[PDB]
Each structure stands twice: as C-alpha cells, then as structure tokens.
Amino acid sequence: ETYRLWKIRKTIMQLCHDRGYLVTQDELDQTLEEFKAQTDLTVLVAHNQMFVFFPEEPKVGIKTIKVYCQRMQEENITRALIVVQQGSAKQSLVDMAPKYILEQFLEQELLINITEHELVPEHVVMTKEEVSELLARYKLRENQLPRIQAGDPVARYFGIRRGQVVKIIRPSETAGRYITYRLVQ
Amino acid sequence: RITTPYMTKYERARVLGTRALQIAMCAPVMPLLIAMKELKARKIPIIIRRYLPDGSYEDWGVDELIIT
Amino acid sequence: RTVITPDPNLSIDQVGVPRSIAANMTFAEIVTPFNIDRLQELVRRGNSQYPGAKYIIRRIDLRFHPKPSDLHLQTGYKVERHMCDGDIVIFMGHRVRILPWSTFRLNLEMNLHLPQSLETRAEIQELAMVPRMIVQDTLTAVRKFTKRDVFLERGEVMNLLMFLSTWDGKVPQPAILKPRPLWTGKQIFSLIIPGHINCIRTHSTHPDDEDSGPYKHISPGDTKVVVENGELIMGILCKKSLGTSAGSLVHISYLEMGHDITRLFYSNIQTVINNWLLIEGHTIGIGDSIADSKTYQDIQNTIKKAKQDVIEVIEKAHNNELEPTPGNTLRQTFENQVNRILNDARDKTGSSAQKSLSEYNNFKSMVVSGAKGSKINISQVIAVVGQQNVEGKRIPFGFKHRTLPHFIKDDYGPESRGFVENSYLAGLTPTEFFFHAMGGREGLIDTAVKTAETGYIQRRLIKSMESVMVKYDATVRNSINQVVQLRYGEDGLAGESVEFQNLATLKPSNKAFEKKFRFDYTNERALRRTLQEDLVKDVLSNAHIQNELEREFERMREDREVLRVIFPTGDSKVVLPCNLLRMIWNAQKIFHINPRLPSDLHPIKVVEGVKELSKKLVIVNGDDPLSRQAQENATLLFNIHLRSTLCSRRMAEEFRLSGEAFDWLLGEIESKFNQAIAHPGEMVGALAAQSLGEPATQNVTLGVPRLKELINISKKPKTPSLTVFLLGQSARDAERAKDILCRLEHTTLRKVTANTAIYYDPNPQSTVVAEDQEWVNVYYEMPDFDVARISPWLLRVELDRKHMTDRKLTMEQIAEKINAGFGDDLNCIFNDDNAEKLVLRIRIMNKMDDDVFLRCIESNMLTDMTLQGIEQISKVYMHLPQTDNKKKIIITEDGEFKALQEWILETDGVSLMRVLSEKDVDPVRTTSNDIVEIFTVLGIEAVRKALERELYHVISFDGSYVNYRHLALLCDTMTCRGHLMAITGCFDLLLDAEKCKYGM
Amino acid sequence: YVFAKKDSKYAYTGECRSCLENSSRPTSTIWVSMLARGGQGAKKSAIGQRIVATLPYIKQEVPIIIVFRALGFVSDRDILEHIIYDFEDPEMMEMVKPSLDEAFVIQEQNVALNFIGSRGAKPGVTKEKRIKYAKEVLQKEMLPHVGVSDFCETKKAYFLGYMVHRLLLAALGRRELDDRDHYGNKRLDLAGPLLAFLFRGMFKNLLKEVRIYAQKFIDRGKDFNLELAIKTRIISDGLKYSLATGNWGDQKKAH
C-alpha cells in the first residue's frame, strides 16, 4: 500500500516544485525505503503560501470542510490542495473561493505524474509582464489564440485560473523548437 | 515594413491581370504580352496595397520590390 | 460535352476542340488598336463560316439579316467571336488547338467552361496552367531505348532529332566509327535532359551485392543511373528514376530549371521514344506467357508437395497431436498453420517464375522497366493463382460442412477450401472456376463501397479547411480570424520546395565524429596535400586562427546533442529545403574543379562564410528579444545541418572546392532559401485536404474504417487498444513479466470454475461427499464462527488446474476476497491444491428462501468477482517486438545508437489511469490509441501530438507518404478550441499617378 | 428458422412465417425467443433464462406455458410431452425449468385465455370479451397452416411445442443454427404467384362495391340487378396500373 503514500507524495512535491513554490532537492528524491518512517503527512511551503491535505475520510463531507477554514484564515494560508480519496461538497469550495482558493484531486489520478510523460510537452505559465509583449509584437488580442479549457488536467496541474496564457515548447521534427501559446478558458 | 520583400505569385496574377486589362482599354503604354514586358522591365503605374490581419496596411510599389 | 480521346501530338497544356463545338462558344473581345484592323474580317463573315462572330456590343444579333449600316467598329466596343487557337479554357487550364472531328483530344467525358475577361484569363495562366499543377507506352519503352545494345545508324538520328523541340540544330558526334558512324541511344537521350542536371539512382534490377570493391561504378548489368552534367553517362532508366518520387530525375528538374523547362522534358520524351518505337514495336504474343519445361515441371514439384504438407497437418491435428499456440484455440491455430503452407508455395512458385523468364520475354519488359507494377499479377499467368478468400478466410462451409456438393464432409484439405493448383494459361478446373468467382466478388463490392467512403472524406475534409490561409504575418489564420499556427508548418517554409537530406553528425559514433569532422591541423602532411603551399604556414603559425577552429567544433558538439533530443529514434532522414549535396556536386562542375590537387580555400573563410550566411536567412523579422528566440528555433534544425555539410574540413577534404567556388556556393543558398519561404496568400486548406484524401484510396483496424472514425472522433472505438511498455529487469524476461501480465486481465471466477452444484448437507460430519470429510472436519475440529446457526445448505464449487496455476492464484486470495466482498456472513472455506481435487465450500451464516438466495450469491460470483486485474480489459497479449520502431533505444558509451528488445504488452480495452499507476508500467513510453481516453488524462497536448500518431499510422501502413505539413494542420484545426470536435484576396491595388504622368 | 441476434434483448430467437396454400391471411410471423442471462436482480438472474412467445396482434411477450394452457391443457406432464421428447436427459430438462416458474399461478384455461386476450388490439372490458377475443386469436391468426378449423387445438400443441424444441437445440449448442443467406430458405416468385397476390386484393374490391350497391337497394326491395352492378373497370385498371408502373399494389397507398 505504501506506494500510495510514497508515489503520491513524490507527485505533490514535484507538483509544487513546478508550480513555482520553494521545494528542496533531497526531499524530492526520498526513496520508499527512506520513507519507511511515516494522516501525519502535510507539505507546507511558500512561494519564490501553500498547504497540502490528506483527509482521513476516504470521502470528504462538508463537516470536514468547515474544520480547516478555522486554520485556513488564522494561519494566513490561501492556496491548498485536498487529495479527496474517492470524491455537492464542491459547492463549498466555491463559497470560500474569491478570498482563498482551494481545489480537489482524486487519489488514484495522482499516483503517477503526467508532466513526465513523453506526449506532454513542458508547459510554462507566463506572467503579465510577458503577456503584455506577446499581445503587442504579433499584434494579437485577448482572445484570438488557441484556447485551452479550465478542467484540463494540465490546467488543473499548474493551478491556472481563467485568463492566463501558457507557452508550449514542443520538440518538433521540421524546425526543432516550435513555440505555441495557449489561452485558458 | 513587416511584409515580404518579394512578389507573391498572387499579386503577379492580379497585377498583370489588370494592367493588361487597362492597356486593352486604351491606356498609355509604358495586351497580355504587353504587360509581361513592362513588369520584367519594371515600368508599371500600380502601387500594391497589402493589408495586415490587425486592420492596418502597407503600400508598396513594384520598383521597391524584387520581382520573380 | 463529349468524349476525351488520347493524342500524343499536343504540348501538354493543349486540347483539341472540334469545329462543331468551338463554333458555339464565345470569347467576348474588347477592341484595341491591334485587333480593330483584324476583327472587321470576323465581323464581315458573320455566323455562316467558322471564323466569325455572334454579337457586336456597340447588341446586334449578327447571325441573320446582317444590316451593313451597323458594321461599324471603333475602339471600346465588345465583339463576341467564336474561337481561335491559343485561347485558354478550363478543366487546370488547357489551350485550344483545333483538330476537326467530334472528340476532345488531349495528351494524357468532360464539359468545357470558358472565362470571359482578360483578368480571369491571366489568373488561370499564372496559377493554373496544366504544367503549373508519363504514360505506360512511353515509360516502358524508355528501358528498351536506353540499354547498351541499342544503336541508331545514320538516318534514324535524322528523325529522332527532327522530333525534338529544344534542339539547337547541331548534330552530336557518335560513338562508333569503324562502320557507318553508329549513335548510341544514350547519346540522344542525353540531348533531351535540359541543361546541367545531376542525379544518381539505381535501376530496379541492381543487386545490392554489386557495390563491392570491383565493379562499383561500372555495374555490368548497366544499371546505376548516373547523369553527370546533363549528359547521360551510364545506366538504364525505369519508372523509379523518371516518375515523381524522391530524388527523381524529373523531380530534380523541377527544383533546378523551373516548370516550363520540365514541360518540354515531357513533350520530348512523349515523342522521340513514342516515335522510335515504330522501329521496335513491343508486341505480346502468347509465347510471352508460357513457361519453358525446365521450370514448368518444377513449378508443379512445389505444389505436389504443398498438397502433401496440408495432409500432414490435418491428420496430425485429427489425432490430438498438435499443441495449440497460446493466444488462440486449436481451431484458429489450425488455420494459421495451414495458411502458412499456402503462401510459401504461392511464393516459391513466384520467385522461380520471375527469374526463369527470358531476357526477350515481353512481360519482363513491363516489370523490370517498372512502368506497370504489380509483379504478382503475372505470377498468376504462369505458375499458380493461389488462395481464394472471403472475409479474410478460406471458403466457409455453405451447404452443411461441404463447400460444394462434390466433396465429402470433414474436408479441410488444400483444395476443398479454395486453393488453386492451376494457372490461367493452363485453364481452371470447373470447381475452381466457382471459387475464383467468389474471391472476385468480395473485391468487386468493396470497390463499390470505397467510392462512397473516400469520395466522402475528401468532400467533407475540404469544408473543414475551407478558408485556412497564410496572412502577411506568415501566421496561419482563417475565416473566424483566429491564429491557428504562428509560423506555417513549424518553420514557415513552403511545401513544394523541400527535399530529403541527412545530417551526418547525428548518426555516427563518438570516435568517428572526432575523426570525420575534427580537422587535426598538426599532422602537417594532410594540409600539405589537402591545402595549398601559401596557407601551409598560415594554419600552423597564428594561434588566433587555430582558436577559431575549435569554436567551430565547440558548437558542433553542442549541435550534436540537440539532434539526440529532437530525434531520439536514431532516424537521420530530415526534410530540409536546399539540397546541400547536389549544390556542392554542382559546383564541382560549373567551375571545372579537379579534386586530386591541393585546395585553395582559406579555412577562416569557411567559418566566417557560414556565420554571415546564417544571419541572412530571415524567417522571423524584428530585433526584439521576443523574435530573436522566436527565430532561432524556426531555424535550429537547418542551421545544424548547415554547418555539418559546409565544415572547414569537409570543404577541404571530401569536396575540394576552390575560392571562387565557395563564394558562389554560399551566396546561392541564400538566393534559393529565400524562395522556400511561403508566399502569404496560399490557400493552404486545399493544399492540405488534397494530401490526405488521396492516400485514402490506396487486429487493429487500419485504413478507411479507422480513418472515418477520427473525422468524427467516435466515443466508442470499434477496436480500442493500449500498448504498454515495461520498466525494469522484468522487461528482459518472460517469467518476470508474467506477474505483470496477470495483473491486467479481468479474471472473474467463471474462468476458473470447473463446475458448481448445490447440496443439502446440514451435518458436515455426514456430507454426501465422503472424500472432503477429512478437511471439512479440519475446519470443524477447531471450528470458527459456527456460532448461532449455519444455514443448512452447501454451495460446492470446484476449481481448475491449468487456469489456477496459469495466473498463480491462491486459495486464500479467492476466499479472502469473497469474505471481504460479502462480509463474514458467507462462511467460505478454502481447501488444498496439494490433493488432485480443488474444492471451495461456501456456506451461509444466519422472504427469499435460502435455496434461491444461494443461487443469487452464486450468480454474482460467476459474473462479478474481479479476482485480479482491471475491468473491461480483455485478452492481454505479450511479445518481443520485431519491427525497429517500437524497440528500446539506448545510447552506449561510444555514442552509438542501439536497439534493445524488451517485452511489450498490447491489450484490448482502455482504462489509462489505473494501468499507468501500477507496478513497473512505464510512466514514459506507455501510450494508447484511443484519442478520447487520451484526452481525459494527459490533456490536450497529447491529442494534438497523438492525433498525429494515428493519421500517420493509417497512411504509412500502405507504405505511402504525406508531407508532415499536411498533418500539422489537421491536428491543429480540431484541437484549436481546447477540445476535440468533428467536421460534419486579402490585399488590394492602387494606381500610381506619379509614374503615370510620364510615359506615352 | 432459428437465427441469432447480436444486441437485442434475447439470445437465440426462433421464427416461423406460417400460411396455407397462398390463400388469404398472408402471414403471422410468430416468434419464440429466449431471453438473455443479463438480468438484474432476482427476476431472471437468480432463476435463469426464460422463453417467451411474440404472438401476432398482441403488443407484449406472452410466455410459453400460458399459451399451452390456453390450448385446453392443464398438467405439466401434458405440456412437456409436447416440448421435450425424451424425459431422461437432464441437460435439456434444466432449460425449461425456469420458465414454468413464471407461468405458475395460472392453471385454468379460463384464466390464461383471459391473460392472453387482455393485451389485444383494443383490450376488452368484460371477461367475456377476453374469453371471446383470444379464442379466435389462437385458432385463426396463429399458425394457420397447421390447421384453421375449430378443433386443431391438439395439433397446434405440437408444432408450437416443436419450435421450443428447436429453440433449445440451438441454445444448448446441440444443433447448428440456420444461415440467413442460404437459398434452401429462399422461394422465388414468377408472374403466376405475383398476380395471385394482385388478384386477391382486387377480387375483394369487386365484391366490396357489390356489398355497397346492394345495401343501398335494400330500402327499395324492388328487384336486384347484377349486370349493371359489376364494375368491370376495377379489374381492368389495377391489373393494368400496377403492372405498368411497378408499384406493386393499389394506387391509393403508394409508399
């Protein structure tokens, strides 16, 4: 079973490494044998801040949801993951959303990392200082790009809201590094 | 000045398709074989209007441009 | 509207319209000072004669009552003459020549449309003339014209020079001169080839062993086409080097000389071999379709053993003496065993028939010459027709186990299911005439179906890309003015001005790369011999010279590595615009260079010449930091090749160019690269819809029922699959991977059940079986959970021996999962596989009386258990791969590529996430073919990349080819909006008045 | 015909298309069909596969043993003595066993015939309608060719029971099932039988206007005359229309 807490934790820490947040080297590289100590599992770091859950309920109820909002708002954390192990209650995550954003992952959807797979080129989320040039050199607009949708599992991976623009550097076989810019919806 | 410094093959269909049309309709010569000589000697009174997809344009003349 | 009839005496862009049809059509001419003295004759004649006119738009109906008061004609008027020669009509755009009968002759029904203006005429002329967008009779006879044997005496040259067009009046000097001065047919065929053109191809008879030490450039069959300097030195031609294929001599003469120089290269060979053949003829007697008796008796000595070795496998399998190969039953492995012994004798009678045909045999002149392919369709003339099939199977039993009323039952033999001993020359048995009437019916319908399949994809996929264009940003934009691609085809380059080239830094090893490209400047005898005496001190002295040439090689090591990232496959065939080994092979001819002398080129001029060139090739404009990285990625793949084949060592050693050569060479690339930049104005939608529906006409379902399914993206694949690779040491063993194999199959308990019954044994000490009373007591000597009342029934299920050790199943994990599946209120008792009978006893702890409810428990465990594996996952195969594409590609410590085998898994049924998650399933190389299932896991960028992996796979299975730029537009109009969906003149002109003031 | 079907709510269905002598009553395509074993709950799955009988003019799936008890039978030896021939083979006797369990509460022929008639064209209200209606269903419009009289109850009991015996012989895999293409199952028709199909539908129309012309003359009762009453242009147009154009039938319902 310890795959499903080691490989999971090795996914989250590579997740929040490439979400931009401060992630150290060796704790990415913990083998399962070196993991033979350890809910009792929570990753808590900040940006270059983030909380990580594992609810002991396999199915999260709303009675669980109002518990940690006491420690959400007091401990001044905003972004937080909930690894809901099986799966109405999503409307609770709409309620607290415009202040502090949270989101929901299935357990076995996360057992392996999809960014490492070869048919997924390495996306990069762009900043508003960089968007404001790409809208100007090509003389593009706010729309009028290849759109990407909200519930996309790489949009869900990086935590992209509606309105950002990611770049895509794919290794292609006529030039080598064709670069494409996905608008998010 | 971000348009291509050559003549695309669609301009040359519409330059020579119309320049031979006016020479057929009693214009000063500077019908189809007439305008082929004028382009390949670069004497044509036409300025190409190339838009851009933003809405803008760029006005090019033939002597500013490299013909095929 | 009338027939088309063939006519090889028209220059290709011509049509023969007869005078009963051109005397109804009109081309409304507007009067100039030119024609005002010409058209008055054509007004004077009227509608009586042929060269006349109908209307005069002054609108006078000049066909009856001519009224000579109104025969005025001043400039500005519009006259509607009938027709003449030289005019242009539409299909492409032909040109009217008049040939008087009732048929439309054209050099290979149709209507005829005629445009009505001098603007839309010239749109057809400079875009869509017939050359701007080779018959059997010519293409065979080119083989016979171009051997060593053929000599033309003196008078026949004076005819085959009369039928050229591009000829300059001067007769060549012949080869032989002791008799009459005989001209070889290769000398005259050198006169057609238009100017300096270079090529090397191999005729379709050339053995691969002929490239040994001796007889390399001689090749005593006179194969190996070598056209140096536009003059045919050696070699026979064929289809392979005169069609339109890669590296073709007609292909090369479109990338050097234009198109109106190549249309003359057709209409010369469409005459001088079409009109030499009146001296050869090329008949087909029936003597050209008879085997000599040396092989004709031996061709039966195969088939008399074929029908023996089918009897050998029927009587072997009718005695239970044939082990079933795993994957299929004894039935399906019987058929695969016998269709093996009827496609080897179909081919051992197929290679010995082609080789046995004589050198004069006229079938061999239409196969070796390659003009008519399908060399299997004349192996049925001579030797053996072969097997018949319907539905992919040899003939099913129609009547009742008897395919015809002439046979016995139990006839699986080699003739009572379809195979044909006889060939069409010897005639066919009256049974086998019926069976070939059945194989000709299954293929006679599919033709009537595959005209309502690929006649519908191509007229639907056009309405997908109806107006996707290239705007003047050279982005890719369409009707709803959205950006599809930022640069057209990932580098901006255009479609029909690229070739196949090789890199030669990717493919070789690590030691060879420091031997082939290193340029050791120190050994002093190389550069003595490979370079001039004036520079032999110049290289050795200055350290500033010697420290640039490392920085050439410094980039090439860091150019080597990026090729081993973009191309992990070790496949070095690259599509790239200007061929940097023809244009070096050219420059050793224009400038008359002797390569056996020391060169005279300065090596810094090589390095500086490349670097100053690579800035002059502008795909993306601008001096921004945005467009700077956005440029050098569009020309990374080409700028690495551009240093590999223009190195400081490769110029001076393999190529021997001179100082006046390299000045011409680098400046010609820039003049030839700048044409392959795409012209903004291209209707790319028609160019890329008509390059995917054309190879639509030519057990994973491949071809049209797969290609139809990706056009609408069906949610339910008729054959989904999931190819699965492996990670560790399990990849190299079949016994380690059997644990991986059994964890994917949906194994219920129906698969392992021997039989099932219900007894009523309320006392376990007195069961109806006395044999189990040993171990039933063992669970009841120290009994557990017999607490209040066991229900007095007994469900007794027996298990198996094969299917229970095939998956290493445990009696515990069956009993534990039922106990975990239904709670402790189902008293399940496992027993031992140590004895030869495996028993599982299932009792019940305390409406729906217990005899019925024990069945419903039993009727759930037959259907819904999931003992192991994942649901909706059928038969899970396993094999080591045979093809060199799906193998594992590990770079060794000498940088060499190496293919390494490993056990792969090809399943049925798709559930991607649980499959990826389990132990030693590869995170990286695992991929499915179900687009819908791959879009809900990996994103949208494993649809855009992996709808390519399917459209390339429904095309390259036929061996065919599609340029990649026509796949990156079907993959990029479906996935534009983030989710997959189904299907179902920008510029202007201004008048320049400042130029218009002067000019008479 | 014991065919097989792919997706539908059955497994190994049968079929017969009875008619006698190319007389009237063109067809009555009675099925007999075995349900699947993909049943949910203890309706079928805890008992096994059942057999039904899609009789004509009944928009339902009237099960088997109900039909035999409408034939004047009572006991379950004298219903299985028309289905299975050897009573000493357990492999067939298992198969019919879960179909007696569904048709179990009805015993008297006054009740099964109420059960059958209660599903008809227009369902009658009294029981005396549903005694009347399904009495002529099961002897006039179900297997006419085995008998059309009012005493063929003993006969029809076999050839209906014969189909169930050929339903089981393919459900067990103990007999090959019929190919659909095979031309032993194909009857051709020529100008003889086709005009017989076109002359029946037009000899009744000759009678139909004689039914109309006479009943519009019962009020007088003066006489009756047929030689003015036979409309000769009924036959001499429809045999000339439908044999000219090809729309093989009358000209009033063309699709």
Swiss-Prot record, chain A:
One of its GO terms (molecular function) is DNA-directed RNA polymerase activity. InterPro entries: Arch_Rpo5/euc_Rpb5, RNA_pol_Rpb5_N, RNA_pol_Rpb5_N_sf, RNA_pol_subH/Rpb5_C, RNA_pol_subH/Rpb5_CS, RPB5-like_sf. It comes from the Eukaryota. Pfam families: RNA_pol_Rpb5_C, RNA_pol_Rpb5_N. It is found in: Nucleus; Nucleus, Nucleolus. Keywords: Acetylation, DNA-directed RNA polymerase, Host-virus interaction, Isopeptide bond, Nucleus, Transcription, Ubl conjugation. GO terms for cellular component: cytosol; nucleoplasm; nucleus; RNA polymerase I complex; RNA polymerase II, core complex; RNA polymerase III complex; RPAP3/R2TP/prefoldin-like complex. Coiled coil: none annotated. GO terms for biological process: protein stabilization; transcription by RNA polymerase II; transcription elongation by RNA polymerase I; tRNA transcription by RNA polymerase III. There is a cross-link at K59 (Glycyl lysine isopeptide (Lys-Gly) (interchain with G-Cter in SUMO2)). Belongs to the archaeal Rpo5/eukaryotic RPB5 RNA polymerase subunit family. DNA-dependent RNA polymerase catalyzes the transcription of DNA into RNA using the four ribonucleoside triphosphates as substrates. Common component of RNA polymerases I, II and III which synthesize ribosomal RNA precursors, mRNA precursors and many functional non-coding RNAs, and small RNAs, such as 5S rRNA and tRNAs, respectively. Pol II is the central component of the basal RNA polymerase II transcription machinery. Pols are composed of mobile elements that move relative to each other. It comes from Homo sapiens (Human).
Swiss-Prot record, chain B:
GO terms for molecular function: DNA binding; DNA-directed RNA polymerase activity. Keywords: Acetylation, DNA-directed RNA polymerase, Nucleus, Phosphoprotein, Transcription. It is found in: Nucleus; Nucleus, Nucleolus. One of its GO terms (biological process) is tRNA transcription by RNA polymerase III. The keyword Phosphoprotein applies. The keyword Kinase does not apply. GO terms for cellular component: cytosol; fibrillar center; nucleoplasm; nucleus; RNA polymerase I complex; RNA polymerase II, core complex; RNA polymerase III complex. It comes from the Eukaryota. Its main location: nucleus. DNA-dependent RNA polymerase catalyzes the transcription of DNA into RNA using the four ribonucleoside triphosphates as substrates. Common component of RNA polymerases I, II, and III which synthesize ribosomal RNA precursors, mRNA precursors and many functional non-coding RNAs, and small RNAs, such as 5S rRNA and tRNAs, respectively. Pol II is the central component of the basal RNA polymerase II transcription machinery. Pols are composed of mobile elements that move relative to each other. Belongs to the archaeal Rpo6/eukaryotic RPB6 RNA polymerase subunit family. This is DNA-directed RNA polymerases I, II, and III subunit RPABC2. The gene is POLR2F. The chain holds residues 51 to 126 of 127 of the full protein.
From Swiss-Prot, chain C:
Pol II enzymatic activities are inhibited by alpha-amanitin. 3'->5' exonuclease activity is stimulated by TCEA1/TFIIS, whereas pyrophosphorolysis is enhanced by TFIIF. Residues 680-707 are annotated as: Trigger loop. GO terms for molecular function: DNA binding; DNA-directed RNA polymerase activity; hydrolase activity; kinase binding; magnesium ion binding; microfibril binding; promoter-specific chromatin binding; RNA binding. Its main location: nucleus. GO terms for cellular component: chromosome; mitochondrion; nucleoplasm; nucleus; RNA polymerase II, core complex. It catalyses: RNA(n) + a ribonucleoside 5'-triphosphate = RNA(n+1) + diphosphate; a 3'-end ribonucleotidyl-ribonucleotide-RNA + H2O = a 3'-end ribonucleotide-RNA + a ribonucleoside 5'-phosphate + H(+). Its EC number is 2.7.7.6, 3.1.13.-, 2.7.7.48. Residues 429-470 are annotated as: Bridging helix. The keyword Translocase does not apply. Changing I445T: In NEDHIB; uncertain significance; moderate. The keyword Nucleus applies. Changing L707P: In NEDHIB; mild; decreased cell viability. Keywords: Acetylation, Chromosome, Cytoplasm, Disease variant, DNA-binding, DNA-directed RNA polymerase, Host-virus interaction, Hydrolase, Intellectual disability, Isopeptide bond, Magnesium, Metal-binding, Methylation, Nucleotidyltransferase, Nucleus, Phosphoprotein, Repeat, RNA-directed RNA polymerase, Transcription, Transferase, Ubl conjugation, Zinc. It is found in: Nucleus; Cytoplasm; Chromosome. Its cofactor is Mg(2+). It comes from the Eukaryota. Belongs to the RNA polymerase beta' chain family. This is DNA-directed RNA polymerase II subunit RPB1. It comes from Homo sapiens. The gene is POLR2A.
From Swiss-Prot, chain D:
It comes from the Eukaryota. Component of the RNA polymerase II (Pol II) core complex consisting of 12 subunits: a ten-subunit catalytic core composed of POLR2A/RPB1, POLR2B/RPB2, POLR2C/RPB3, POLR2I/RPB9, POLR2J/RPB11, POLR2E/RPABC1, POLR2F/RPABC2, POLR2H/RPABC3, POLR2K/RPABC4 and POLR2L/RPABC5 and a mobile stalk composed of two subunits POLR2D/RPB4 and POLR2G/RPB7, protruding from the core and functioning primarily in transcription initiation. Part of Pol II(G) complex, in which Pol II core associates with an additional subunit POLR2M; unlike conventional Pol II, Pol II(G) functions as a transcriptional repressor. The chain holds residues 206 to 460 of 1174 of the full protein. Belongs to the RNA polymerase beta chain family. This is DNA-directed RNA polymerase II subunit RPB2. DNA template strand binds at Q251. DNA promoter binds at K204. It is found in: Nucleus. It comes from Homo sapiens. Signal peptide: none annotated.
